[PDB]
């Protein structure tokens, strides 16, 4: 009686440590692409009848 | 205070020149880096594309070989020539400026811009 | 089936194979679209530069098919019925690839976004980036050197 | 064989080894960042008070020292024919885990007052030993650390 | 125009390439016909690469008449 | 929010499965001794090693944007900086060579072991050294090449004011690299007396 | 019944069937939405060019069939009694299609929406809006070829 | 291996040994850091307040000191064969000195940069700071007392 | 060991221990924090005034005796071999005294920054000050109270 | 130790005793806080209405008292030799009036502070508020008759 456990395994334990690894480096490059923003100055027309 | 400040210059000098040894000859490994990089994406190339038409018999044989071909020669001309030429030019520039100058060159001398006329674009 | 050869092994080829390009593409991405908005803003005004500023765009694809070439070699070592030993080799080469690509990719995005914008207003500051984006190129580089040193391991008098 | 010596000991014990830099290193690390940008930050005001103003910067650097003492002391103390008690490896844990953080609190203390003392001694120049004085109390903190995790190390083995 | 040099110079060595390639499987050469994977009889595969080649030939002819003027 | 109450959702349940074992005399169950043995030590031997190149290159191309992004702003008005300020795109550079070097090192410790001496003393040493020296490298050179790229992001704004101070913040840059090179060292005597799988 | 094919194998398959097309439906999808804004605002002012800044929109739409495709094919492939083997292969090629195309979508929105406008100021960039957005297609085509690559390798010689 | 005495209890009496270093020195590190930035911006000033409003400093020094003797004292007593009852009164003495003294240095911290701040400019306030401090300082004393009950009880009366 | 008086058991009692002097020290410090940077503010004008404002410091510092006094109790019921009762018990007699003295210090700390700050423009507030402090300081007592209760029931009548 | 009656029955007593005057004071406490502000601030220019804005503060500490009460019964039925129905009684009595007495010290600190601010300007809105402190603490009120009718059950019929 020496095995780990019949349904915790250490062949399904070793998998899912891996996708949580796995998972865990997807949903940091998944912040830093929603933190994108464009740049709209630089591509509206504005124009001043003060300054020009 | 002069005596100082041919110290703290020669205390830099060992400690850079000391660990400078050990980070130079480690940046040389970039030579056997690049050169396999540049030879496995050569094979995986021809694997893909050429190494395909051959296995096939008839017109619809000959069409790939002249369609395949083309794509292998572009790719060749543009991936591994231009991107990976600039790329390995730009290293061999790197090893000049920081590693081989590093030893010998002092630099921060004056030019020579003499006074001459020239045609003005404007 | 064996002490040797379990029946979950191909997992972590499967899982590897996968994440080399999942990891290298997101990477290409947040450099291509972060970069390809300073071109977007440049050329307004300056449009002469455009084809010149489309390097970085350039240095960004070439990361990804850095994660297809090692999609490609350790998707031809699996099998039903491979080692353990075989497994974690496969796993460790997208891993490294994947990770590697994805740091190298924002780099580019990042530098190549203000190069386009500032040689816009300095035409000696091209050559300059040029330069600081070679150097994140590379590391994509160095991450494809130690998928290969493993695969080659891989199935080496495995029984 | 003996209950005392199961054979995941050594887990434990490198895992003491690595947090003794990882975490030494994230102190000197943020020592030399954060008063590097008090330094620079005057220097296009005084340049002259540059070459006085390291010593925040070689007292983060001591930091890095300690944990190096520490980690090498640990390694030579595992190998794969020696026995290695399960014992001694929750000591060589702790040996890691006390000189890390009590460096890595070093580290936020020295950075912080570097910063503001470099700003603020360019207006100010007999502010100079009092700036020194609050830096060795800081120091000493990852001394405390040390003490300690070189009497485990003593006692873990015998 | 560059739209004619492009072909010009493509289809210059693929008349070159391809029939040094034809030469090698005619002649059952090891590198190309040594492994099992490779296709097992060399010279029927070098008659669909020598038709191949003249398909490259006729866009360099044309193509260079085309430059020329 | 949302994802720090998950943080305090998940410690609720470990409690509360720890004290429905225990209190139920079945505490023995949760034996993390048996997870280290029975799993197999090529598994930590591959993360380690590239937890090491990959977490040394998130640090490098970390740095390089700091460094870069400012020295592009900076020399805008002072375009002479770029070359002289590319020292430090050198040293955060240099890291990812460190973690190369030592994926060297271990690979040539990647052997193939009989199924009955597979779970000895030596190749489950084999396996934590690996693990936690890879750690050590690549966690300590993410430390050192961010640090680096703040160093070196002053020193070229203080370059562009004055030509003079770039040589002083130049020494607070080198201390910084010799982080990276105490890592090497330390990973290096962990798996000194390690020896290849049998 | 049998040690290499559990009862459990089909979990793996179907989720790499569903996971292929919600995972280049959801990048599609922000292509379009983020791009469909851009159209709308410059159009209202010259709609001579909406006919030629819809190219975002049919990009977007390129990718979510790169997706229906692999779910097609590895529908298939699938049985009550089949190797866990065969079930890892399929959730392989699932992902890597899919998070690949998520990728490209990201990109092809943000350069869409910047380059329509910026086209509405500066006749000239839309030649590079077009060259900027061929290398995020071509991101999710890696991804259907490591997908098919592996497929084809999901039944043959298997037991 | 007796019940009373497992292999695994010395690590509850190391937890606590390294408990008592964790938490007193980032209470220490706070409260030296906070007062030391009070104590920068007047001295511009008035630095003839120096070596007086460093006091704050060194009670925060004080809450280090405290937590070096439960450690040392702790790790005196710790061995290869133990019992559990002298592993979980060791954490109980580290987790009281420590979690304890981290209280004091986010008192000391907040009181020394206003009461420094505040006698620059009357001197009358001097006394009233080191009140409070003394009453923010005795809160980590109590917290040792606790523990040196608990470590002469660890090793009495047990098998 | 035995079925009613296991090994594990005083680890509840030693870390019911520490709880009566954590939570207490933290509570006592939100106090002294608040209260005072309110009097370092106030006192610059009107000195005269600050022997009386030390009350809030002195109410928030009787909190943590009452955390150090259940602690003593229960360290002299400790015991290799103690029952499960008396261990769950010490440990309800800490979380009470220890989170309801948390909740009367950050009540005292609110109340005695404001109050002091008000009292320099109107004497009249300061007795109500005070009475308005009575009632949060009598929260920490009712913790006490159920706490000695408890621990005068842990050894009672017990096997 | 027996089936219906185990060794970790008075686990779930003991947390009843504790959290029932936890709650209660954590929310007496938010209550003597938020209104503490509102009377300091008000009457510095109208110090007669000092004795009369004390209300909300007052009622804030009758919650406690309800915590006491229940703690103090179910004090008196912890036992070594329990069953755990008995346990499961005690934890709801507990949970029951501690919970429903944050709400009431919430609803009391909102009102009392807006009630305070308007009864200096208005004085026929001072005997509006009350009301609304009344519909407040009969909340807590029932809480109460859940708990001492849950704990009458607790004992009887139990074997
Ligand atoms: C697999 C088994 C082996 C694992 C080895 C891992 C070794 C890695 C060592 C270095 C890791 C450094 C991680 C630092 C992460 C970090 O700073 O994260 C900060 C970040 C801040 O988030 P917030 O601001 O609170 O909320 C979001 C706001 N929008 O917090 C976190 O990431 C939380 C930490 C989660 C760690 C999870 C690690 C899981 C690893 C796999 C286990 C299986
Ligand atoms: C069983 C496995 C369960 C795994 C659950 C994973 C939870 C992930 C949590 C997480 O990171 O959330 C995203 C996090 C939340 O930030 P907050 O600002 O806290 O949001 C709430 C604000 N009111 O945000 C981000 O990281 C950026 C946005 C993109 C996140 C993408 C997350 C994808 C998660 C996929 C899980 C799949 C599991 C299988
Ligand atoms: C990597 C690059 C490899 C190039 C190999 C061929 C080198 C020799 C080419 C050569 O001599 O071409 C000369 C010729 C001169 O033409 P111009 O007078 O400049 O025409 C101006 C029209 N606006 O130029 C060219 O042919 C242009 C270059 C064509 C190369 C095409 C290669 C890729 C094919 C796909
Ligand atoms: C390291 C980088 C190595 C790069 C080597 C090649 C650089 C060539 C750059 C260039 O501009 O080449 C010009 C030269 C043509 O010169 P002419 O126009 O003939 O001169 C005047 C004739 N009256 O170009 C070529 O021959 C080929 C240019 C490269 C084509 C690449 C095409 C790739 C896509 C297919
Ligand atoms: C082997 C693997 C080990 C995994 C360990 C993971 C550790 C994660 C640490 C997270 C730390 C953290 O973010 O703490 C957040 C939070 C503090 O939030 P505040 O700053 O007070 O919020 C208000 C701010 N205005 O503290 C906590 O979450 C404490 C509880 C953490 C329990 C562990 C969480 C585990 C999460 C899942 C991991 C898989
Ligand atoms: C979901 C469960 C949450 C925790 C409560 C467990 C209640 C329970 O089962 O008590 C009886 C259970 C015995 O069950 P068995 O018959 O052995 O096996 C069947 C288990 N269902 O008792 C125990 O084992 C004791 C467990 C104590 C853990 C701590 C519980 C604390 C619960 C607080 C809840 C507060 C409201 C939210
Ligand atoms: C945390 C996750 C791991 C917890 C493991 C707990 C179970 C365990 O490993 O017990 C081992 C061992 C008992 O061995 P047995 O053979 O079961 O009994 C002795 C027989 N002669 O445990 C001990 O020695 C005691 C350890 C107790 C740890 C505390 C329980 C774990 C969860 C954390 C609880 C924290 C306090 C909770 C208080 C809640 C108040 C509201
Ligand atoms: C605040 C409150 C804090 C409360 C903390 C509670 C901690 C509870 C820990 C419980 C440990 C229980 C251990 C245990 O009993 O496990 C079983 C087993 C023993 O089983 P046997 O008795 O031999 O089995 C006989 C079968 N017939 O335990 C062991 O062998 C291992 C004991 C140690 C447990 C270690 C737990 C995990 C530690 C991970 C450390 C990671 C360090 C990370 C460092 C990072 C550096 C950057
Ligand atoms: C040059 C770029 C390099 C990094 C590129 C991304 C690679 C990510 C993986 C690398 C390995 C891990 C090293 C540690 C990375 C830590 C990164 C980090 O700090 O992430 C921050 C980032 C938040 O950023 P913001 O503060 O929202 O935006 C910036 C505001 N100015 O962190 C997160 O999103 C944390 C997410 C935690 C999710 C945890 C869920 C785990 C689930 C496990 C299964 C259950
Ligand atoms: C991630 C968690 C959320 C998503 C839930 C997904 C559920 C799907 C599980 C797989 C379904 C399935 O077919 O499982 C069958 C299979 C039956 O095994 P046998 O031994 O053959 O049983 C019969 C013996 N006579 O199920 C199992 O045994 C698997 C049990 C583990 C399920 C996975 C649990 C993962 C939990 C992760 C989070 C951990 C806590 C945080
Ligand atoms: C077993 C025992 C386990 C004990 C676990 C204790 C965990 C404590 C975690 C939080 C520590 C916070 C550290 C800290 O700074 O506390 C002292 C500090 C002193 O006051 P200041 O913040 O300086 O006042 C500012 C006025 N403007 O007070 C606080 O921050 C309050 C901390 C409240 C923590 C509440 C934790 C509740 C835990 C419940 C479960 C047990
Ligand atoms: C077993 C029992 C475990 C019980 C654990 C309870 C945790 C206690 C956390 C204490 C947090 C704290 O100190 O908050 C006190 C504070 C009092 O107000 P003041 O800060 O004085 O003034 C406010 C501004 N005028 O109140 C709050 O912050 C509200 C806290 C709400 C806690 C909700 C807990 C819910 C738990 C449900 C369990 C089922």
Redesign the interface.
Known sequence: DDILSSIWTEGLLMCLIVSALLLFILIVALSWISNLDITYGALEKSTNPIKK | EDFGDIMIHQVIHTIEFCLNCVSHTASYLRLWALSLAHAQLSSVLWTMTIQIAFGFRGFVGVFMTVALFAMWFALTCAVLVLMEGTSAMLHSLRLHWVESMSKFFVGEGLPYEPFAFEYKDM | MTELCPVYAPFFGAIGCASAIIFTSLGAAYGTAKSGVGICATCVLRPDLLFKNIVPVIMAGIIAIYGLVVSVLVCYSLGQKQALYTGFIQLGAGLSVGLSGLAAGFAIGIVGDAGVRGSSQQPRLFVGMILILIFAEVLGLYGLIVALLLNSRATQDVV | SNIYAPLYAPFFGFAGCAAAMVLSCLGAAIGTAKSGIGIAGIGTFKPELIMKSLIPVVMSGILAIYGLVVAVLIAGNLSPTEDYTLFNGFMHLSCGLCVGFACLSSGYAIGMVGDVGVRKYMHQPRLFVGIVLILIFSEVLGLYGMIVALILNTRGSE | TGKAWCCTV?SA??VV??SVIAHL?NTNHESFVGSIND?EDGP??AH??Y??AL??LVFFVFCGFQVYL | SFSHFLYYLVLIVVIVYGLYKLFTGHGSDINFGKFLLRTSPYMWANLGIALCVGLSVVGAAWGIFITGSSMIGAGVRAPRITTKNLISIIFCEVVAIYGLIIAIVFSSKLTVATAENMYSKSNLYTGYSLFWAGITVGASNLICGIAVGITGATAAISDAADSALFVKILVIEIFGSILGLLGLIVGLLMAGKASEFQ
Request: glycine share 6%; charged share 0%; proline share 7%.
């Open positions: 493509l060595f693929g390439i391809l499987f296709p029927a595969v669909t690469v038709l191949a398909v490259y």
